[PDB]
DNA sequence: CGAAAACGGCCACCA
DNA sequence: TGGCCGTTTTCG
């Protein structure tokens, strides 16, 4: 179980993400999906006794929001070497849906030589909206997304890593494929509300957390 | 009669599913169809005196929602070996309608060597909607579904096992073929309402049940 | 004959 | 209602 670094969120998840499965967090923009991704990108490298996976991180960005400085902040919060964190995070920006899936081909071969624990795909659904904008082409983007999700599940079962994808809510296919769906909504200021909206094992429940300069971290009224 | 593991639902069914016949549960998404399937996948292995069938389980998944951990939770609830439960559940994900029917060919030969009591097909109608999306191809998916249902009835009469298929309600052919139709709807929180909408023997009636971490289990206000 | 435009008709979404 | 395409006519 990879620690989220929010204790309340860890309790909500019973200790953190299950490696080897896809966890989807759907919420409005600015809810902190990207911030949680940046935090996990570092916490994954933490020792297992500290809630990490003792593995490198993979950040596939489609939205430009990748900040190595956020990774440095998370590393210094938990006392990890920021330089080693950036050395254990491989980053690449996907320009389109086809490029987004093509990067998985390099990811599968690269993930064999080194132990990874986390795969991050940020604005995973944005490129299927910007690229495929027509109505007759909807089935094509749905097929590409389906294949992409199957590839995610395959890599998860192959390397035993956690698969994190982010969705902006301004597909029903992900429900059966994703094991845990988390709904994120803004509480005013920088403090966010998290809700579980389906889990066969986890209750439907809510937990409050905040977005702090160092971290994605528990709410401290 | 295979125990549902909800006492109120067992009373609704007069003790549980009749083996050798198809029981259809149609309801909205998140009503708990999959949860009931996971529970039954373990309860089938229970002794007959405990409401089981003393047989192995078969889970054909089309939606990715298969969770061995849910099976482990159901096994520990009723005190069954979780490892033996997973050893008595054969699992396979159908990628399309043709693959969904093709898996029945392996199922028929495999079900001869060992005693099974339950066959689960989850999102059974989803692949006929994702694969066959056009309007001119509707008769083709209806024919494939008809043949699939006939194969289900044949296997039910051959092995005396319970046939469970799940349908998302966002065909009229199943009515004559399915013996008991159950309508599932959400009560808020995790507690679900079950209604019988046709049975020649069972009354039209309703029963309240809940979805608990261990189990599909009676409502406990 | 044919550019071009002016109309007409047809479709998309979901209401 | 907006867009696109078939057409029709109109003017050179």
């Amino acid at each position: 179980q990879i620690t989220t670094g929010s204790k309340e969120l860890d309790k909500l998840l019973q200790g953190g993400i299950e490696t080897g499965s896809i966890t989807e967090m759907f919420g409005e923009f600015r809810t902190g999906k990207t911030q949680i991704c940046h935090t996990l990108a570092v916490t994954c490298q933490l020792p297992i006794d500290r809630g990490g996976g003792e593995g490198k991180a993979m950040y596939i960005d489609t939205e430009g929001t990748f900040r190595p400085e956020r990774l440095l902040a998370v590393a210094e919060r938990y006392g990890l070497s920021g330089s080693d964190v950036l050395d254990n995070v491989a980053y690449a920006r996907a320009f389109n849906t086809d490029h987004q899936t093509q990067l998985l081909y390099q990811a599968s071969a690269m993930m064999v030589e080194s132990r990874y624990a986390l795969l991050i795909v940020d604005s995973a659904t944005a490129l299927y909206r910007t690229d495929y904008s027509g109505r007759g082409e909807l089935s094509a983007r749905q097929m590409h997304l389906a294949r992409f999700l199957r590839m995610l599940l395959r890599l998860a079962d192959e390397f035993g890593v956690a698969v994190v994808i982010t969705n902006q809510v301004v597909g029903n296919i992900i429900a059966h494929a994703s094991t845990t769906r988390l709904y994120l909504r803004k509480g005013r200021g920088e403090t966010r509300i998290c809700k579980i909206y389906d889990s066969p094992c986890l209750p439907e429940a809510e937990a409050m957390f905040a977005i702090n300069a160092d971290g994605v971290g528990d709410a401290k009224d």
Side-chain angles (χ1 to χ4, degrees), chain A:
Chain A
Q1 292 170 327
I2 305 173
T3 182
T4 73
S6 176
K7 301 301 178 181
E8 294 299 323
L9 192 53
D10 285 354
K11 302 295 184 292
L12 189 59
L13 304 174
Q14 299 289 79
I17 301 291
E18 280 207 57
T19 54
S21 62
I22 305 174
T23 307
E24 180 184 17
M25 68 307 300
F26 65 101
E28 302 291 335
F29 61 95
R30 206 169 54 94
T31 58
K33 292 188 305 290
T34 312
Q35 298 299 323
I36 300 174
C37 295
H38 285 57
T39 297
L40 297 174
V42 186
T43 62
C44 61
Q45 307 178 31
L46 292 168
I48 301 172
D49 174 297
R50 294 191 61 187
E54 297 174 14
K56 298 181 177 182
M58 293 300 291
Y59 201 109
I60 297 179
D61 174 81
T62 74
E63 49 170 284
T65 57
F66 183 80
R67 295 295 181 272
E69 297 189 348
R70 293 298 299 161
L71 309 178
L72 300 177
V74 183
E76 60 82 21
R77 173 187 176 183
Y78 292 89
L80 297 180
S81 176
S83 60
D84 274 335
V85 170
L86 298 184
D87 294 330
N88 297 330
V89 174
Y91 166 74
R93 180 173 182 179
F95 284 171
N96 54 79
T97 59
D98 192 72
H99 185 208
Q100 181 176 324
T101 303
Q102 194 276 341
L103 294 179
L104 296 186
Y105 176 77
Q106 302 180 358
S108 60
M110 188 285 283
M111 194 148 279
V112 172
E113 297 181 17
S114 301
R115 173 171 171 88
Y116 286 80
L118 182 58
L119 174 58
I120 302 172
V121 184
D122 200 24
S123 279
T125 65
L127 301 183
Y128 287 99
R129 310 173 182 176
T130 60
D131 298 352
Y132 300 87
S133 298
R135 289 300 178 181
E137 216 171 348
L138 294 172
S139 61
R141 72 180 181 73
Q142 298 177 333
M143 288 321 171
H144 196 84
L145 178 57
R147 186 176 57 189
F148 180 81
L149 298 175
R150 295 192 300 270
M151 293 177 70
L152 295 180
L153 186 58
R154 293 181 183 173
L155 292 178
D157 303 331
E158 189 173 25
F159 302 99
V161 306
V163 180
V164 176
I165 61 181
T166 69
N167 185 22
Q168 305 177 339
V169 182
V170 178
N172 300 326
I173 189 167
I174 313 170
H176 60 285
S178 63
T179 67
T180 311
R181 268 179 168 192
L182 311 177
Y183 174 77
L184 309 177
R185 65 176 179 274
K186 184 190 176 198
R188 324 316 281 184
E190 294 286 17
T191 319
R192 306 304 201 278
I193 311 171
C194 180
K195 183 183 178 180
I196 292 176
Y197 190 72
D198 171 49
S199 188
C201 190
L202 301 170
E204 183 178 2
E206 307 180 331
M208 193 55 191
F209 69 98
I211 309 174
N212 288 318
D214 304 338
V216 167
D218 296 308
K220 300 297 178 179
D221 49 357

Short mmCIF file of all heavy atoms in Angstrom, two decimals, chain A residues 18 21-22 143 150 153-154 173-180 197-204:
data_model
loop_
_atom_site.label_atom_id
_atom_site.label_comp_id
_atom_site.label_asym_id
_atom_site.label_seq_id
_atom_site.Cartn_x
_atom_site.Cartn_y
_atom_site.Cartn_z
N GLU A 18 -3.61 0.06 -3.40
CA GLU A 18 -3.14 -1.27 -3.75
C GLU A 18 -2.31 -1.19 -5.03
O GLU A 18 -2.81 -0.78 -6.08
CB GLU A 18 -4.31 -2.23 -3.91
CG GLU A 18 -4.86 -2.75 -2.60
CD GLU A 18 -5.52 -4.11 -2.73
OE1 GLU A 18 -4.85 -5.06 -3.20
OE2 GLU A 18 -6.71 -4.23 -2.38
N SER A 21 -3.09 -2.40 -9.39
CA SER A 21 -4.46 -2.10 -9.80
C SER A 21 -4.56 -0.63 -10.14
O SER A 21 -3.74 0.19 -9.73
CB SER A 21 -5.47 -2.47 -8.70
OG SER A 21 -5.23 -1.71 -7.53
N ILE A 22 -5.59 -0.29 -10.92
CA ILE A 22 -5.84 1.08 -11.34
C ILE A 22 -6.77 1.76 -10.35
O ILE A 22 -7.84 1.23 -10.02
CB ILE A 22 -6.43 1.12 -12.76
CG1 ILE A 22 -5.52 0.37 -13.73
CG2 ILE A 22 -6.62 2.56 -13.21
CD1 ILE A 22 -6.09 0.24 -15.13
N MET A 143 -12.42 3.46 -28.45
CA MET A 143 -11.60 2.29 -28.69
C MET A 143 -10.15 2.51 -28.26
O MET A 143 -9.54 1.63 -27.64
CB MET A 143 -11.65 1.90 -30.17
CG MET A 143 -12.98 1.29 -30.60
SD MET A 143 -13.66 0.18 -29.35
CE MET A 143 -15.28 -0.14 -30.04
N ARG A 150 -6.63 -1.24 -21.15
CA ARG A 150 -6.20 -2.63 -21.12
C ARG A 150 -4.68 -2.71 -20.98
O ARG A 150 -4.17 -3.54 -20.23
CB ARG A 150 -6.67 -3.38 -22.37
CG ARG A 150 -8.18 -3.53 -22.48
CD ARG A 150 -8.55 -4.52 -23.57
NE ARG A 150 -8.07 -4.13 -24.89
CZ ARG A 150 -8.75 -3.39 -25.75
NH1 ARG A 150 -9.97 -2.97 -25.48
NH2 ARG A 150 -8.20 -3.08 -26.92
N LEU A 153 -3.85 -2.07 -17.36
CA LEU A 153 -4.08 -3.26 -16.55
C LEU A 153 -2.98 -4.30 -16.77
O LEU A 153 -2.52 -4.95 -15.82
CB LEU A 153 -5.45 -3.86 -16.87
CG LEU A 153 -5.91 -5.03 -16.00
CD1 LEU A 153 -5.94 -4.65 -14.53
CD2 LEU A 153 -7.26 -5.55 -16.47
N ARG A 154 -2.57 -4.48 -18.03
CA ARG A 154 -1.51 -5.43 -18.35
C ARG A 154 -0.20 -5.05 -17.67
O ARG A 154 0.46 -5.89 -17.06
CB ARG A 154 -1.37 -5.46 -19.87
CG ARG A 154 -2.61 -6.05 -20.53
CD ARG A 154 -2.54 -6.14 -22.04
NE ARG A 154 -3.81 -6.65 -22.55
CZ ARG A 154 -4.14 -6.73 -23.84
NH1 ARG A 154 -3.31 -6.34 -24.79
NH2 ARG A 154 -5.33 -7.22 -24.17
N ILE A 173 -16.69 2.98 -19.41
CA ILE A 173 -15.80 1.84 -19.59
C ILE A 173 -14.82 1.71 -18.44
O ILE A 173 -14.43 0.60 -18.06
CB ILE A 173 -15.09 1.93 -20.95
CG1 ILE A 173 -14.34 0.63 -21.24
CG2 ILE A 173 -14.15 3.13 -21.00
CD1 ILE A 173 -13.88 0.50 -22.65
N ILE A 174 -14.38 2.83 -17.86
CA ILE A 174 -13.37 2.74 -16.81
C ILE A 174 -13.92 2.12 -15.53
O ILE A 174 -13.15 1.57 -14.74
CB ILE A 174 -12.81 4.15 -16.54
CG1 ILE A 174 -12.47 4.85 -17.86
CG2 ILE A 174 -11.56 4.07 -15.66
CD1 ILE A 174 -12.14 6.32 -17.72
N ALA A 175 -15.24 2.19 -15.30
CA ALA A 175 -15.80 1.71 -14.04
C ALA A 175 -15.42 0.25 -13.74
O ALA A 175 -14.89 -0.05 -12.67
CB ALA A 175 -17.32 1.86 -14.06
N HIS A 176 -15.69 -0.67 -14.68
CA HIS A 176 -15.32 -2.06 -14.43
C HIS A 176 -13.81 -2.24 -14.35
O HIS A 176 -13.32 -3.15 -13.67
CB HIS A 176 -15.94 -3.03 -15.45
CG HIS A 176 -15.56 -2.78 -16.87
ND1 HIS A 176 -16.07 -1.74 -17.62
CD2 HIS A 176 -14.74 -3.47 -17.70
CE1 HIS A 176 -15.57 -1.79 -18.84
NE2 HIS A 176 -14.75 -2.83 -18.91
N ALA A 177 -13.05 -1.38 -15.03
CA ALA A 177 -11.60 -1.54 -15.11
C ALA A 177 -10.91 -0.93 -13.90
O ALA A 177 -9.98 -1.52 -13.34
CB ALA A 177 -11.06 -0.91 -16.40
N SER A 178 -11.37 0.25 -13.48
CA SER A 178 -10.82 0.91 -12.31
C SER A 178 -11.37 0.21 -11.08
O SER A 178 -12.56 -0.12 -11.01
CB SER A 178 -11.17 2.39 -12.30
OG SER A 178 -12.58 2.59 -12.21
N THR A 179 -10.51 -0.02 -10.09
CA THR A 179 -10.95 -0.70 -8.88
C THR A 179 -11.49 0.26 -7.83
O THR A 179 -12.40 -0.12 -7.08
CB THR A 179 -9.79 -1.50 -8.28
OG1 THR A 179 -8.77 -0.60 -7.81
CG2 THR A 179 -9.20 -2.44 -9.32
N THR A 180 -10.98 1.48 -7.76
CA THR A 180 -11.41 2.42 -6.73
C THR A 180 -11.62 3.78 -7.37
O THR A 180 -10.68 4.35 -7.94
CB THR A 180 -10.39 2.51 -5.59
OG1 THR A 180 -10.03 1.19 -5.17
CG2 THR A 180 -10.97 3.27 -4.42
N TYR A 197 -16.68 6.74 -4.27
CA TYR A 197 -17.96 6.62 -4.95
C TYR A 197 -18.24 5.23 -5.48
O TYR A 197 -19.39 4.92 -5.80
CB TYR A 197 -18.04 7.63 -6.11
CG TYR A 197 -19.42 7.76 -6.71
CD1 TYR A 197 -20.44 8.40 -6.03
CD2 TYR A 197 -19.69 7.25 -7.98
CE1 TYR A 197 -21.70 8.53 -6.58
CE2 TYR A 197 -20.94 7.37 -8.54
CZ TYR A 197 -21.95 8.01 -7.84
OH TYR A 197 -23.20 8.13 -8.40
N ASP A 198 -17.22 4.38 -5.57
CA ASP A 198 -17.43 2.94 -5.65
C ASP A 198 -16.17 2.26 -5.12
O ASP A 198 -15.06 2.63 -5.50
CB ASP A 198 -17.71 2.49 -7.08
CG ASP A 198 -17.71 0.98 -7.23
OD1 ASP A 198 -18.37 0.30 -6.41
OD2 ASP A 198 -17.04 0.48 -8.15
N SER A 199 -16.36 1.27 -4.24
CA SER A 199 -15.34 0.27 -4.02
C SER A 199 -16.01 -1.00 -3.52
O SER A 199 -16.77 -0.94 -2.54
CB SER A 199 -14.29 0.75 -3.02
OG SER A 199 -13.21 -0.17 -2.95
N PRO A 200 -15.75 -2.14 -4.15
CA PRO A 200 -16.22 -3.42 -3.59
C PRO A 200 -15.72 -3.70 -2.18
O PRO A 200 -16.42 -4.36 -1.41
CB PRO A 200 -15.68 -4.46 -4.58
CG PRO A 200 -15.45 -3.70 -5.84
CD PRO A 200 -15.04 -2.32 -5.43
N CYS A 201 -14.54 -3.21 -1.82
CA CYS A 201 -14.02 -3.35 -0.46
C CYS A 201 -14.10 -2.07 0.36
O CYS A 201 -14.35 -2.14 1.57
CB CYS A 201 -12.57 -3.83 -0.51
SG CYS A 201 -11.89 -4.32 1.10
N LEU A 202 -13.89 -0.91 -0.25
CA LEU A 202 -13.91 0.26 0.61
C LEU A 202 -15.33 0.84 0.71
O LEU A 202 -16.06 0.86 -0.29
CB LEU A 202 -12.97 1.34 0.10
CG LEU A 202 -11.49 0.99 -0.05
CD1 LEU A 202 -10.75 2.08 -0.81
CD2 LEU A 202 -10.86 0.77 1.30
N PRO A 203 -15.71 1.28 1.90
CA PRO A 203 -17.00 1.96 2.06
C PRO A 203 -17.09 3.20 1.19
O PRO A 203 -16.08 3.84 0.88
CB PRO A 203 -17.04 2.31 3.55
CG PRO A 203 -15.61 2.40 3.95
CD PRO A 203 -14.89 1.36 3.13
N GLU A 204 -18.32 3.55 0.79
CA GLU A 204 -18.61 4.93 0.42
C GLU A 204 -18.45 5.81 1.65
O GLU A 204 -19.18 5.66 2.64
CB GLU A 204 -20.01 5.05 -0.16
CG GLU A 204 -20.38 6.44 -0.65
CD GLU A 204 -21.77 6.50 -1.26
OE1 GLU A 204 -22.46 5.46 -1.27
OE2 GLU A 204 -22.17 7.59 -1.72
#
